[PDB]
Design a binder for this molecule. Sequence first.
Ligand code: FMN
Length: 108
Amino acid sequence: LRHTFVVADATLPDCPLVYASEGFYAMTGYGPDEVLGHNCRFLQGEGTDPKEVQKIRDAIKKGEACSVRLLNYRKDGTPFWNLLTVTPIKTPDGRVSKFVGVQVDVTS
Ligand SMILES: Cc1cc2nc3c(=O)[nH]c(=O)nc-3n(C[C@H](O)[C@H](O)[C@H](O)COP(=O)(O)O)c2cc1C
């Protein structure tokens, strides 16, 4: 329940984040001045499995929900495991307006 939440704008090509919960900032070490307006990929690094990343990339392309485990890094460079679940939010016309994401640090 110590999960975090963010919102990405799907009307912009690179799904930049337009909102992040208090927790997301505190957990990652990053502040709004460095996350808002940017694609969430900045949390990835050397150990991030490119196959899981591809999985999210493809789901977003198709406007579908996706859940994957990714190794992410805090602002100080330290690693942590993030169980990410992305959900598309559509307008009545069927087009995708936003992407919602729930991040859970499952490092245990
Ligand atoms: C709403 C939302 C939240 C995301 N949260 C994270 C995250 O916490 N960590 C991460 O590594 N990637 C996260 N992503 C994945 C990247 O933002 C991006 O969708 C993905 O890496 C696409 O592949 P690409 O970087 O190869 O273009 C999120 C994506 C969306 C749409």
